[PDB]
RNA sequence: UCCCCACGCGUGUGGGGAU
């Protein structure tokens, strides 16, 4: 088979101060969510990823079984976590969503910086997917990808992190690499709610 | 274009950034 991954949908409660705090600062959200897989993290067995969807919905992917009893009472409605074992096959077509921080490390300075233009952002996605065992699907008028949102996360512990929300259609090229890509996430900002590549038929 | 790790991929690549 393939390795277990767990998807948890959390519907956060606007009435909760803790929920509002985490919603306003991805650094705090990271602190909270990490509690659900704390031991696995310490043991090097975990890659926590999440996305705040556009009440507020947070999708959390973990490689190990989360324990959401760690959450404060009234913090969120926790839907039953779902274990899935992706069955990726060569040529399989999938829709995808990915909120990412397209970036490069400058050769001259050694600093990782955000890519500036939409063309650069799309090229980055194409390269990441291809090196990761996928490929964007194409059409007569361009690659099958949209940028739904291009904004900044305001992170404290003030840094601004560019967040680009991609949605489109792709195909599986190499199932082994593709599975690893889903488990690892794509690009920087993984501890801020970026990098979760979600796929579905 | 904030910090850190790896490198004889540097008009950079990959990885990390709770307790």
UniProtKB/Swiss-Prot annotation:
Impact reported for residue 30 to A: 99.8% loss of cleavage activity, binds RNA normally
Enzyme Commission number: 3.1.-.-
Cysteine pairs bridged by disulfides in the record: none
GO MF terms, alphabetically ordered: endonuclease activity; RNA binding
GO process terms (BP): defense response to virus
Major enzyme class: hydrolase
Effect on the protein of changing residue 157 to A: 64% loss of cleavage activity; 99% loss of cleavage activity
Effect seen on changing residue 28 to A: 71% loss of cleavage activity
Annotated family: Belongs to the CRISPR-associated protein Cas6/Cse3/CasE family. Subtype I-E/Ecoli subfamily.
Described function: CRISPR (clustered regularly interspaced short palindromic repeat), is an adaptive immune system that provides protection against mobile genetic elements (viruses, transposable elements and conjugative plasmids). CRISPR clusters contain sequences complementary to antecedent mobile elements and target invading nucleic acids. CRISPR clusters are transcribed and processed into CRISPR RNA (crRNA). This enzyme processes pre-crRNA into individual crRNA units, but may not actually undergo enzyme turnover, retaining the crRNA product. Generates a 2',3'-cyclic phosphodiester.
Protein name (Swiss-Prot/TrEMBL): CRISPR-associated endoribonuclease Cse3
Native organism: Thermus thermophilus (strain ATCC 27634 / DSM 579 / HB8)
Gene name of the encoded protein: cse3
